[PDB]
Design a protein around this ligand. Structure first.
Ligand SMILES: *[C@@H]1O[C@H](CO)[C@@H](O[C@@H]2O[C@H](CO)[C@@H](O)[C@H](O)[C@H]2NC(C)=O)[C@H](O)[C@H]1NC(C)=O
Ligand SMILES: *[C@@H]1O[C@H](CO)[C@@H](O[C@@H]2O[C@H](CO)[C@@H](O)[C@H](O)[C@H]2NC(C)=O)[C@H](O)[C@H]1NC(C)=O
Ligand SMILES: *[C@@H]1O[C@H](CO)[C@@H](O[C@@H]2O[C@H](CO)[C@@H](O)[C@H](O)[C@H]2NC(C)=O)[C@H](O)[C@H]1NC(C)=O
Ligand SMILES: *[C@@H]1O[C@H](CO)[C@@H](O)[C@H](O)[C@H]1NC(C)=O
Ligand SMILES: OC[C@@H]1[C@H](O)[C@H](O)[C@@H]2CC[C@H]1N2
Ligand SMILES: [Ca+2]
Length: 641
């Protein structure tokens, strides 16, 4: 009936911000080679204040060279003694975010680690000081090379924590003059971190924030008892259709209401990875065609705006928040300066299901809600109104101002289903707008890369999405014809997060492709035992990369070749001998059409009319038999969709 908003009895918890994750894994892969001005426009929709999603927080993966959901991300230390703070795209993204919003909150979290840190085991806790040292170098590098202050550091994404590690990480941060950096744990479930904090005072002293993943809007008693800030440090992960925006809208409010969580962070920031990769299109917006410049400002962007444009880290939640009689919820926040923001959501069950978890049915129906401002809020006489309707339009439309002149801190609204209203004293709200970007277009049916870039802006060539291993621009001054190549640089399996393949692989192109010819120059660096391949119709990647099928044309340094149906190499289409050795450049061609494939070695036919599964479709790919050095050059693909 009448919902009282008041601050006279005091305030609730401090609001810590809304944000999103770039990483886990390679989710921003295809954004770096967007042409201007579109790349810049995309970044504005995400980070420019009073414009789009206007994010308060940016969380990035600390790349460890392993596969972490939609690809691998490069580490700053591939090997022992190696340090490089210019690989990948997270440095860039953080800087671009920081340019638009100097106050954005930066977080880093490892998913995987380079293998050498395990010292012969696939475990990051073998040498506590070493792993901490590795992580802190990243934070230092961020500052020294990019002028970035990392605000929060996590432990190991959705993987066990070690209490002694967390303590050592804190000590190592302090030793390096990073007392200001805070620690969030354990980016998994509420337990065992929450009870551990209650039993171990020294642990309690070093953990600043408890971050839980996909909590279903609820926390647990031990976490509340701890007095720590509680965050949904990873949520959403739903297709950014209308249902995802609904999901997002609902949890943004109810994470605080039901669970005392004062921050929520969406996986992921922007869908800039092939859609046929795991969890495709589960970013706040979509930017998966750098070749065309086409992007989509999806519904979740505006749902975010309803909170982010009208709140900032350091505002406080009111004590008076809750559910509406006929379903839906409201929160309210102030900045202790006379501003008030109110965010109301009526997401229906049928249009707001998140993937994790799925909620039992609940009812929303037409209702009236009366709001009364008590205490220090009585003096508000005017509120701006922002409105969104999900289902088929209207997104973030500014409605007519409401007046509260009646002397009665009150007003009423007619609420229907699947709506959002924001009511705030702030006048800075804006539905940012750029002209529409180019229409959607398939990946180019003819495509070439000779990797001849002397000072590349990024460490890897556009569109190649590593799914196991790490491929990088490589300069070899001692060769002329192959001065500039692409190289696989991992020489041992990472401390994996996912089940990485046993073979390295990078995929590219149009998953819809069915008939195609792929050609590449290859160079095996490891004598006797080394091997490389080129492939087409590759149908799975990311977390599922081990499961990839397609047509794989392998050559080996022992003078042999194989054609397989799978990356694992368990199913043979053909095999034989070849004039092939290490440390020599060969041109490989693989032609797939209908039921049949053929392979060429240096323009000469090696095998032909070999029967392959059909129908089938997928990407082109390159890679190596194990985690081994190899080079690639003059890549070309002609394909039919
Ligand atoms: C956690 O949030 C809950 C709300 O979910 C807060 O508890 C409410 O407290 C009021 C009175 O203080 C009760 O009338 C409500 O019934 C409580 N809510 C529920 C759902 O039972 C609580 O203050 C928060 N815990 C903290 C801040 O430690
Ligand atoms: C609401 O918030 C705005 C923005 O923070 C406040 O306006 C600022 O007030 C400070 C001092 O209180 C000034 O130094 C800034 O220049 C102001 N900025 C802007 C953009 O106006 C405002 O005081 C708050 N209260 C109300 C009633 O608007
Ligand atoms: C890929 O190649 C196959 C094999 O040639 C094509 O299938 C043929 O298509 C023609 C006309 O479209 C038919 O007359 C043949 O009977 C088909 N043969 C088989 C075995 O299916 C297929 O159309 C090609 N697809 C693309 C997208 O180019
Ligand atoms: C939802 O509530 C309305 C009124 O309370 C009722 O008429 C309707 O049948 C309910 N829907 C379900 C599925 O229970
Ligand atoms: O919903 C899938 C999410 C992403 O894949 C992130 O990488 C982590 C791992 C699972 C979940 N959080
Ligand atoms: Ca070259």
């Amino acid at each position: 009936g009448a919902y009282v908003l008041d601050d006279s009895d005091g305030l609730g918890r401090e609001f810590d911000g809304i944000g999103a994750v770039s990483g886990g894994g390679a989710t921003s892969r295809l954004l770096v080679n967007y042409p201007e001005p579109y790349r810049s426009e995309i970044l504005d929709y995400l980070f420019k204040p009073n414009f789009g999603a206007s994010l308060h927080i940016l969380k990035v993966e600390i790349g460890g060279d392993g596969q972490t959901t939609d690809g691998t991300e490069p580490s700053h230390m591939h090997y022992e003694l190696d340090e490089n703070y210019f690989r990948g795209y997270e440095w860039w993204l953080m800087k671009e975010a920081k340019k638009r919003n100097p106050d954005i909150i930066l977080m880093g979290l490892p998913w995987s680690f380079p293998g050498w840190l395990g010292k012969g085991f696939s475990w990051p806790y073998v040498n506590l000081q070493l792993t901490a040292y590795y992580v802190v170098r990243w934070i230092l590098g961020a500052k020294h090379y990019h002028d970035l202050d990392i605000d929060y550091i996590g432990i190991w994404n959705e993987r066990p924590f070690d209490a002694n590690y967390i303590k050592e990480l804190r000590k190592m941060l302090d030793y390096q003059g990073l007392q200001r950096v805070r620690i969030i744990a354990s980016d998994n479930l509420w337990e065992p971190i929450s009870s551990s904090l209650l039993l171990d005072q020294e642990l309690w002293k070093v953990v600043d924030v408890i971050g839980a993943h996909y909590p279903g809007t609820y926390t647990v008693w031990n976490a509340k008892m701890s007095g720590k800030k509680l965050w949904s440090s990873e949520d959403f992960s739903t297709i950014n259709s209308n249902v995802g925006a609904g999901c997002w809208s609902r949890i943004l409010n109810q994470n605080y209401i039901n669970g005392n969580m004062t921050s929520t962070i969406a996986w992921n920031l922007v869908a800039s990875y092939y859609e046929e990769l795991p969890y495709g299109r589960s970013g706040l917006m979509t930017a998966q065609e750098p070749w065309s410049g086409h992007y989509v400002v999806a519904s979740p962007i505006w749902v975010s705006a309803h909170t982010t444009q009208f709140t900032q880290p350091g505002w406080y939640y009111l004590k008076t928040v809750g559910h509406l009689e006929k379903g839906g919820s409201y929160v309210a926040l102030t900045d202790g300066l006379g501003n008030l923001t109110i965010i109301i959501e009526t997401m229906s069950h049928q249009h707001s299901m998140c993937i994790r978890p799925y909620l039992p049915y609940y009812n929303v129906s037409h209702q009236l809600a009366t709001f009364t401002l008590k205490g220090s809020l009585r003096e508000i006489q005017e509120l701006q109104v922002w409105y969104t309707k999900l289902g088929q339009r209207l997104h973030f439309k500014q409605l007519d101002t409401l007046w509260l002149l009646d002397g009665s801190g009150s007003f009423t609204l007619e609420l229907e289903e699947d709506e959002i209203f924001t009511l705030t004293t702030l006048t800075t709200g804006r539905k940012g707008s750029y002209p529409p970007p180019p229409s959607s277009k398939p990946f180019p049916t003819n495509y070439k890369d000779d990797f001849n870039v002397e000072y590349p802006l990024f460490s890897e060539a556009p569109n190649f999405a590593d799914q196991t291993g790490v491929f990088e621009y490589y300069m070899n001054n001692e060769d002329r014809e192959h001065r500039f190549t692409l190289r696989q640089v991992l020489n041992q399996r990472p401390i994996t997060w996912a089940a990485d393949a046993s073979s390295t692989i990078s995929v590219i192109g149009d998953h819809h492709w069915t008939n195609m010819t792929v050609q590449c120059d290859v160079y095996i660096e490891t004598p006797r035992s080394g091997g490389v391949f080129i492939a087409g119709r590759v149908n799975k990647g990311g977390i599922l990369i081990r499961s990839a099928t397609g047509v794989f044309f392998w050559i080996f340094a022992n003078g042999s070749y194989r054609v397989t149906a799978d990356l694992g190499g368990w199913i043979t289409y053909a095999s034989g001998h070849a004039d092939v050795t290490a440390k020599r450049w060969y041109t490989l061609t693989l032609g797939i059409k209908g039921y049949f494939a053929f392979g060429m070695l240096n323009g000469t036919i090696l095998w032909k009319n070999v029967r392959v599964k059909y129908p089938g479709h997928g990407w082109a790919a390159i890679g190596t038999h194990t985690f081994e050095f190899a080079q690639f050059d003059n890549f070309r693909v002609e394909a039919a969709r």
